[PDB]
Amino acid sequence: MHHHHHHASVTARTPQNFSVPSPGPLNTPVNPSSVMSPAGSSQAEEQQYLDKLKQLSKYIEPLRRMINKIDKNEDRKKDLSKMKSLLDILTDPSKRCPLKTLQKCEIALEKLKNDMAV
């Protein structure tokens, strides 16, 4: 008789950002008319789309620090809305992040970097 698992209990299930479910292989359609990938060339686009969410998912933090050093400048008071926005965007809890926001955050944060580095 082992002795170690005596403190927890299986009561209800509730995942949190990739915990229980893990959609990997896409070879089982369910929606009507699904021929947007006959040759099977849509994995790198489905992977980068999610990989891009994770790409800026890192820059989403540095923004918080910027929001302070930015509001700190009366001349760059306008940029304050850029960091707070980018951060408020990339933090989308609906898991609905279109390449438009990702690409914009990357392009925006990039243009804001050139002005931050003197």
From Swiss-Prot:
The record's account of how the chain is modified after translation = Ubiquitinated by TRIM11, leading to proteasomal degradation.
Q: What upregulates this protein?
A: By 12-O-tetradecanoylphorbol-13-acetate (TPA).
What compartments host this protein? Cytoplasm; Nucleus
Q: Where is this motif: Nuclear localization signal?
A: 64-81
Composition-biased stretches, type Polar residues, lie in 10-20, 28-46
Tissues in which the protein is found? Expressed in all tissues examined, including heart, brain, lung, spleen, thymus, pancreas, blood leukocyte and placenta. However, the level of expression varied, with highest expression in the placenta and peripheral blood and lowest in the pancreas and kidney.
Job of this protein: Component of the Mediator complex, a coactivator involved in the regulated transcription of nearly all RNA polymerase II-dependent genes. Mediator functions as a bridge to convey information from gene-specific regulatory proteins to the basal RNA polymerase II transcription machinery. Mediator is recruited to promoters by direct interactions with regulatory proteins and serves as a scaffold for the assembly of a functional preinitiation complex with RNA polymerase II and the general transcription factors. Required for cholesterol-dependent gene regulation.
State how it assembles.
Answer: Component of the Mediator complex, which is composed of MED1, MED4, MED6, MED7, MED8, MED9, MED10, MED11, MED12, MED13, MED13L, MED14, MED15, MED16, MED17, MED18, MED19, MED20, MED21, MED22, MED23, MED24, MED25, MED26, MED27, MED29, MED30, MED31, CCNC, CDK8 and CDC2L6/CDK11. The MED12, MED13, CCNC and CDK8 subunits form a distinct module termed the CDK8 module. Mediator containing the CDK8 module is less active than Mediator lacking this module in supporting transcriptional activation.
Family assignment?
Belongs to the Mediator complex subunit 15 family.
Could you identify this protein by its name?
Mediator of RNA polymerase II transcription subunit 15
The source organism is: Homo sapiens (Human)
